[PDB]
Amino acid sequence: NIMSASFAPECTDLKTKYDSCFNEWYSEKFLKGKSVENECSKQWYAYTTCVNAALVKQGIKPALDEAREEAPFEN
Amino acid sequence: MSASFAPECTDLKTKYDSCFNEWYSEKFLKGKSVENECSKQWYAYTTCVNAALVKQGIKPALDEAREEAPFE
Amino acid sequence: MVLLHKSTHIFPTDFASVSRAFFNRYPNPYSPHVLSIDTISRNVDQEGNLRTTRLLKKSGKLPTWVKPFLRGITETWIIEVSVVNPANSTMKTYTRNLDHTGIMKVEEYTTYQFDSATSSTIADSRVKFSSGFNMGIKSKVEDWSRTKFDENVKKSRMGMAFVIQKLE
Amino acid sequence: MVLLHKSTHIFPTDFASVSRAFFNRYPNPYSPHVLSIDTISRNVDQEGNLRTTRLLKKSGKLPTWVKPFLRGITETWIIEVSVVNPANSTMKTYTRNLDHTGIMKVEEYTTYQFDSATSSTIADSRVKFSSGFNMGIKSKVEDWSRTKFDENVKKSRMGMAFVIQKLEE
C-alpha cells in the first residue's frame, strides 16, 4: 500500500487523493467515452496548488517552465 | 657526453661530433670550405646507428618524417 | 555527438491495462531510484486526447572513471510528456532530463499501440543521447598545452644559455 | 583541434655561439629527460646551407587523469630538423614527436637570427599543438549509453509488467 511520494512531502497525501480520483475517472469514464471533463477538480486544484507553491522555490523551475513550452511530438 | 640511443654507437658518435664541431666552427661558419672532413667518422657512426635503427619500432615513423619538408 | 538506440517489446495485454500501468508505474521494485513523481498538468484537448506532463526525480551515481571530469551528481529531474488517444488506442510518451543537459541529454520516445490482430500492445522505443560537452576535454587539453609550452620555453632558453656559457 | 603558442627571446651572443650551442645543447641540467640524441643525416645543400636531421629520445609521462584511459607512455621519439645559413646568419629549427601523434602532436618552429644592430641573436618560437583524439573517453561515453539504454529498457518493461499484474489482481 506504499504510494509514490511528491517531491514536496507536504503534497504527498494530496497527490494520493488526486491520483486515486484520476485513476477511477480514467478507467471508468475517459477510456469508455463517458467523460472528457475534470471530475477530480477539487482534488486536482488542492494538489497542484501545493506543488506549484513548492516549485517556486526549486532551482529546476526555469528549466521546467521552458520544457512545458516545447512540443516533443512536434505540434 | 650525450649518448646514442644505441649504446654501442656512443663512442663513434662522440668521435663524429667532435670532428663536426671543429669543422663547423673553423671552416663552415668562416666560409673556408664546405667539404666533409669527417667522412670516415660519419660513415662509421651512421653505419652503427642505421644497423640499430632497423630493429627499432620507430623506424617507419622516422623514414616517413625524413621525407617531409617542414620549412616548406 | 548523437547516439541512437531502439528497442521493441510486446505486452500481451490490452490498451486500458498498459496505459493505466504507465500512469501508475511508480513505485515498483525495478526502479528504486525514482524518488518521486508529480503531475504538473493534465487536460483533454479538443481532439479528445488526454495530455499529461509529469515531473520525476531520480537518484543515481556517476561511473567512477567520470567523477574527476564531472562535479557531484546524485540526482536528476526528468520531464515525462504523454498523449493518450482512446479512439485509436495509442499512447505516445516522451521523457528527457531537465538538468545536466550540458553534460548529457537523454531523450526517449516510447509509443504504446494496441494491435487488435494479436490482442497485444506493442511498445516501440527510440532513445537519443546527445552532448557536445565532450566531458570538458577541450579545456583540459588547452591547459596541458599551455603548461607544456611554458615549461619548454624556459627549459630551452636556460639550457641554451647554460651551454653557451660552458663553451664561452 | 589546433592550439598555437608563440614566444621570443634575445640571446646577447653571436650566431656562431648560439648555433654551436644548439648542436651541442645535450646534455644540460635543464633537459634531464633527454636520454639521447643522434644525427640521422647532414649535408650542405645547393644554397650552401647546412641541413641536419637528428633523432632524440625523451622520457616522459602522460597526465595522471589520462593514464586510466591511455596506454602507459614512458618515452617519446622526437625528430629535429635544422638549416643553417652561414651567409645570413640564420638557423631554422623544427621539432615534432614521431610517436604518440594519435594522442597529441607538438610541432615547434624556432628560428635564430643574428641582428647586427643589437649584436644579438633573436630566437622566435612558434609551437602548434594538434590533437583530434579525445583521450579515448568518447568510446567510454558510448559504452555508457549502451549500458544505460539496456538498463532502462529492462527496468521500464519489468516495472510496467509488475504494475499490470498488480492492477489486474
Numbering used by the authors:
A (entry chain A): 3 to 77
B (entry chain C): 5 to 76
C (entry chain B): 1 to 168
D (entry chain D): 1 to 169
Quoted from the paper:
The full-length Ups1 (175 amino acids) and Mdm35 failed to cocrystallize, yet Ups1ΔC5 lacking the C-terminal five residues and Mdm35ΔC5 grew cocrystal. The crystal structure of the Ups1–Mdm35 complex was determined from its SeMet-labelled protein crystal by the single-wavelength anomalous dispersion method using the anomalous signal of selenium atoms, and was subsequently refined to 1.40-Å resolution against the data set from the native crystal. The asymmetric unit of the crystal contains two Ups1–Mdm35 heterodimers, which have a similar conformation to each other, with root mean square (r.m.s.) differences of 0.6 and 0.3 Å for 168 and 72 Cα atoms of Ups1 and Mdm35, respectively. In the asymmetric unit, two Ups1 molecules were found to form a domain-swapped dimer; the two Ups1 molecules exchange the identical C-terminal helix (residues 135–170) each other. Therefore, the domain-swapped conformation likely arose from the crystallization artifact, and we thus refer to the monomeric Ups1–Mdm35 heterodimer, in which the C-terminal segment is connected to the polypeptide of the remaining part in the same molecule, as the Ups1–Mdm35 complex. Ups1 contains two α-helices (α1 and α2) and a seven-stranded antiparallel β-sheet, which is folded into a half-barrel structure (β1-β7) and an Ω-loop (Ω1, residues 62–71) is formed between the β3 and β4 strands. Like free Mdm35, Mdm35 in the complex with Ups1, takes an antiparallel α-hairpin (α1 and α2), yet the C-terminal segment, which is disordered in free Mdm35, forms an α-helix (α3). Mdm35 embraces Ups1 with the three α helices, covering ∼1,400 Å2 (12% of the total surface area of the Ups1 molecule), rendering the Ups1–Mdm35 complex folded into a single-domain like structure. A closer look at the crystal structure of the Ups1–Mdm35 complex indicates that the hydrophobic side chains of Tyr20, Phe24, Trp27, Tyr28 and Phe32 in the α1 helix and Trp46 and Tyr49 in the α2 helix of Mdm35 bind to the hydrophobic region formed by Phe15, Ser19, Phe23, Thr39, Arg42, Leu50, Val84 and Pro86 of Ups1. The entrance of the pocket is nearly closed by the Ω1 loop.
Recently, Ups1, a yeast member of the conserved mitochondrial intermembrane space (IMS) proteins, was shown to mediate PA transfer between the mitochondrial OM and IM in cooperation with Mdm35. Mdm35, another conserved yeast IMS protein, is a binding partner of Ups proteins, and facilitate their import into mitochondria. Surprisingly, two distinct polypeptides of Ups1 and Mdm35 form a single compact domain, the Ups1 part of which corresponds to the START (StAR-related lipid-transfer) domain, likely functioning as a lipid-binding domain. Like other START domain-containing proteins, the Ups1–Mdm35 complex contains a deep pocket that can accommodate a lipid molecule and an Ω-loop likely functioning as a lid for the pocket.
